[PDB]
Amino acid sequence: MMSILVISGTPRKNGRTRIAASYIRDRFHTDFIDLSESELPLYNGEEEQNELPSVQALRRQVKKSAAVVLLSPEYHSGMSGALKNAIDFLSSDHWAYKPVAIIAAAGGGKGGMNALANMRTVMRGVYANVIPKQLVLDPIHIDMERRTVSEDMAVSLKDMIEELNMFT
Amino acid sequence: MMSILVISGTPRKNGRTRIAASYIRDRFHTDFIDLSESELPLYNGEEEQNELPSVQALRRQVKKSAAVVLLSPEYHSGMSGALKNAIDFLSSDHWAYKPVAIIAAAGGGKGGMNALANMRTVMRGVYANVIPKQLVLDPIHIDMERRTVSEDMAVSLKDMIEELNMFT
Amino acid sequence: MMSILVISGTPRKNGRTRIAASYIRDRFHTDFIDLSESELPLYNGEEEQNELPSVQALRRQVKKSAAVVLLSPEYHSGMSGALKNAIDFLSSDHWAYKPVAIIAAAGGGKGGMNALANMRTVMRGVYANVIPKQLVLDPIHIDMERRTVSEDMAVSLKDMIEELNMFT
Amino acid sequence: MMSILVISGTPRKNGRTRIAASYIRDRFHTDFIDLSESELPLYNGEEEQNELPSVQALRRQVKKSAAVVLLSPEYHSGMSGALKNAIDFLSSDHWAYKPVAIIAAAGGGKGGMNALANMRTVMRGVYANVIPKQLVLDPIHIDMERRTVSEDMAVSLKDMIEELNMFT
Numbered sequence: 001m002m003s004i005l006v007i008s009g010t011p012r013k014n015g016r017t018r019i020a021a022s023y024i025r026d027r028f029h030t031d032f033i034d035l036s037e038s039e040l041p042l043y044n045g046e047e048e049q050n051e052l053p054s055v056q057a058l059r060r061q062v063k064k065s066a067a068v069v070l071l072s073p074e075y076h077s078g079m080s081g082a083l084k085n086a087i088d089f090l091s092s093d094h095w096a097y098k099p100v101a102i103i104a105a106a107g108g109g110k111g112g113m114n115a116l117a118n119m120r121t122v123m124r125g126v127y128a129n130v131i132p133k134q135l136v137l138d139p140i141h142i143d144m145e146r147r148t149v150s151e152d153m154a155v156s157l158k159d160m161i162e163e164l165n166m167f168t
Numbered sequence: 169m170m171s172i173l174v175i176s177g178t179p180r181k182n183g184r185t186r187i188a189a190s191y192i193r194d195r196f197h198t199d200f201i202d203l204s205e206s207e208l209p210l211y212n213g214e215e216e217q218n219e220l221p222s223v224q225a226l227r228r229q230v231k232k233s234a235a236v237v238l239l240s241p242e243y244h245s246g247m248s249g250a251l252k253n254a255i256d257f258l259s260s261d262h263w264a265y266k267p268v269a270i271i272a273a274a275g276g277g278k279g280g281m282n283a284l285a286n287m288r289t290v291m292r293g294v295y296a297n298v299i300p301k302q303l304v305l306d307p308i309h310i311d312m313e314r315r316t317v318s319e320d321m322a323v324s325l326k327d328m329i330e331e332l333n334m335f336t
Numbered sequence: 337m338m339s340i341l342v343i344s345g346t347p348r349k350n351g352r353t354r355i356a357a358s359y360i361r362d363r364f365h366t367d368f369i370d371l372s373e374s375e376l377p378l379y380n381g382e383e384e385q386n387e388l389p390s391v392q393a394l395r396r397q398v399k400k401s402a403a404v405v406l407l408s409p410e411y412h413s414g415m416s417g418a419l420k421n422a423i424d425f426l427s428s429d430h431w432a433y434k435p436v437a438i439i440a441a442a443g444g445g446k447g448g449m450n451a452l453a454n455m456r457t458v459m460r461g462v463y464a465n466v467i468p469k470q471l472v473l474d475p476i477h478i479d480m481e482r483r484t485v486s487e488d489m490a491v492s493l494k495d496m497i498e499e500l501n502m503f504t
Numbered sequence: 505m506m507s508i509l510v511i512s513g514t515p516r517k518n519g520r521t522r523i524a525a526s527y528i529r530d531r532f533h534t535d536f537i538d539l540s541e542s543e544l545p546l547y548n549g550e551e552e553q554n555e556l557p558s559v560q561a562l563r564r565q566v567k568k569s570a571a572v573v574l575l576s577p578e579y580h581s582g583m584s585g586a587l588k589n590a591i592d593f594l595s596s597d598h599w600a601y602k603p604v605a606i607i608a609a610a611g612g613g614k615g616g617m618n619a620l621a622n623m624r625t626v627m628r629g630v631y632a633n634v635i636p637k638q639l640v641l642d643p644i645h646i647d648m649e650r651r652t653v654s655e656d657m658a659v660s661l662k663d664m665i666e667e668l669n670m671f672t
């Protein structure tokens with residue numbers, strides 16, 4: 001399913017979001033953008049950034065994807081600045097009508113729902129079609145030592161991919 | 169009023185948000201953070217970033233301020249990635265109970281309200297006290313040639329500063 | 337297109353939302369729920385309400401519809417209490433995967449976007465598929481004397497119905 | 505503390521929100537509005553509603569309060585229609601600058617955060633000052649048999665009242 005693009009929105013190379021994103025990439029054989037090892041600079045509006053290979057690659061990969069799984073940690077009740085910075089390079093030219101499944105990684109408790117709301121609002125702002133199924137990944141869902149997701153989360157992610165494909 | 173800190177959240181050196189932010193800085197004699205000329209890197213969670221002068225300065229300036237005017241452009245129905253990246257370096261240690269006035273710069277029409285909602289949610293996430301008065305700056309409110317705000321917007325900004333001081 | 341259900345969420349019989357909703361009903365030959373002339377009581381959780389004809393009709397009409405146009409005025413930065421009360425009688429049994437187009441009627445200026453966000457969040461909460469195209473109807477878009485919508489709004493509504501049908 | 509007004513926003517007489525709201529009323533000796541036993545009709549915009557005793561009482565009680573604890577269940581990712589209906593009778597005349605603490609009652613899991621966001625947005629829409637401290641009451645926090653809150657929730661509510669008083 002290389003027509004699906006998984007975007008790992010944590011900038012932390014050891015972040016939980018990246019464990020979940022890499023799991024999805026390998027389980028469903030997707031394309032991948034990893035914001036913990038990206039050469040993207042901070043967007044600054046200057047024309048020269050349009051010529052940067054990292055920016056050109058981001059735009060090309062997002063535009064070509066048939067569907068996106070968008071993962072972000074919840075940092076201070078919003079998506080990560082790293083993910084929002086990447087989105088600021090993009091527009092409805094890359095996203096319009098694209099099916100998108102959103103996942104937030106949180107710290108437990110009630111966390112993650114504010115990031116999901118922020119992601120849904122921004123995705124609608126680029127005219128994406130965010131599917132109803134959304135997920136919060138808590139620490140209980142991530143095995144740090146084995147670098148994978150829990151059994152129940154794996155079932156949930158399969159259901160999410162099935163719904164994403166239905167909207168594609 | 170150097171106890172007020174104005175944060176210009178656009179990364180664009182010629183951005184409208186920066187014209188409004190600089191106006192407030194000069195009119196009310198505030199401290200200033202300009203995310204269009206910052207050395208802040210993308211937050212990456214690594215311990216080494218705690219030693220960076222740009223990060224130390226951001227934390228020191230926010231923590232010491234008695235109140236903040238937080239300005240951001242609305243990019244894709246959210247605050248800028250540049251501003252969110254800066255906030256990701258911070259915590260309730262720098263923001264708790266601080267009075268904050270939020271301003272979004274938009275393109276006209278209905279724009280700006282989604283950025284304001286995102287800013288209010290993230291600010292509450294660091295335990296700031298966002299005051300009720302909020303503003304959207306549209307192109308009609310910004311004189312690009314004279315690099316200042318319109319007469320009606322200047323009145324609105326004075327009312328905002330007065331309310332911010334009341335909550336301080 | 338009686339498979340489309342238009343829900344007029346204003347409780348005001350002379351409200352602008354109802355002018356727009358009735359326009360859509362007549363232009364596209366839809367089903368109709370009018371919350372300005374409904375016998376629905378306030379939801380109170382009591383079992384007896386499940387037997388009320390108004391509640392049974394609301395549930396039957398929503399469940400059978402292939403798609404919904406959901407209109408609400410923005411009252412205090414949210415959808416109307418009348419519309420939310422009606423939704424409180426419903427569940428994912430009536431809404432799951434249903435394509436929904438949301439419209440907010442506002443007072444001009446920046447109004448309407450908070451109602452749209454509230455509507456999108458609640459609709460996702462019942463598992464509906466809210467389409468990307470959303471509209472705010474301002475007073476300039478409503479002819480009170482002729483009880484219809486402006487020419488530009490009529491074009492926008494046709495585009496909205498076309499997109500809604502695509503997602504159906 | 506009769507200058508504090510507690511608003512129980514569930515319409516269900518046996519609802520968990522009402523157990524928490526009644527606990528606060530009795531513990532802190534507050535004024536009380538109970539939307540499970542209210543004579544308020546659905547707001548309909550007609551002038552005659554301004555003369556109804558229930559509407560006059562709601563407006564008088566809210567306006568006179570020095571601070572409000574606003575409780576609502578989360579119904580479909582928003583505040584209850586009953587509470588929103590009551591707010592639709594009100595305006596900034598009753599709420600402007602009033603300190604407000606928001607509490608959502610949820611079903612467990614991740615629930616409650618969408619109601620809190622909706623409540624914060626609507627309260628800002630009437631110019632209230634919603635304090636940073638917010639709470640979600642889950643079933644674990646409510647003793648149905650004893651009709652009171654758990655020990656840890658009682659501590660949290662005392663901290664909330666202390667913060668509300670600070671903003672008053």
Ligand SMILES: Cc1cc2nc3c(=O)[nH]c(=O)nc-3n(C[C@H](O)[C@H](O)[C@H](O)COP(=O)(O)O)c2cc1C
Nearest residue numbers: 010012015016017073074075076077105106107111
């Ligand atoms: C700056 C920062 C802010 C955070 N804010 C939140 C938050 O608002 N809510 C939450 O549930 N977790 C929050 N967390 C914890 C993350 O959810 C947690 O680290 C999770 O593993 C996702 O981040 P990661 O993918 O980088 O590991 C925050 C973490 C950091 C470093």
Ligand SMILES: Cc1cc2nc3c(=O)[nH]c(=O)nc-3n(C[C@H](O)[C@H](O)[C@H](O)COP(=O)(O)O)c2cc1C
Nearest residue numbers: 178180183184185241242243244245273274275279
């Ligand atoms: C990537 C990008 C996204 C934008 N998204 C929005 C938007 O969602 N809503 C809006 O009203 N304006 C949007 N704008 C326009 C800005 O509001 C406008 O440029 C304004 O001047 C603020 O940006 P600035 O301070 O960088 O100039 C966007 C601009 C850019 C470059």
Ligand SMILES: Cc1cc2nc3c(=O)[nH]c(=O)nc-3n(C[C@H](O)[C@H](O)[C@H](O)COP(=O)(O)O)c2cc1C
Nearest residue numbers: 346348351352353409410411412413441442443447
């Ligand atoms: C109680 C009340 C609250 C309102 N709040 C808002 C608001 O927050 N934002 C806005 O743009 N208009 C607001 N309005 C104005 C409505 O948007 C306007 O009346 C519009 O016509 C939709 O309402 P209607 O369909 O009942 O006419 C409010 C009107 C009332 C009566």
Ligand SMILES: Cc1cc2nc3c(=O)[nH]c(=O)nc-3n(C[C@H](O)[C@H](O)[C@H](O)COP(=O)(O)O)c2cc1C
Nearest residue numbers: 514516519520521577578579580581609610611615
């Ligand atoms: C129509 C309806 C919708 C509900 N929606 C949600 C929801 O979106 N999220 C949630 O956590 N709980 C939801 N609940 C469960 C309530 O949170 C739970 O009943 C809680 O006790 C608060 O309601 P109460 O005060 O009326 O008892 C819903 C309950 C009903 C009856």
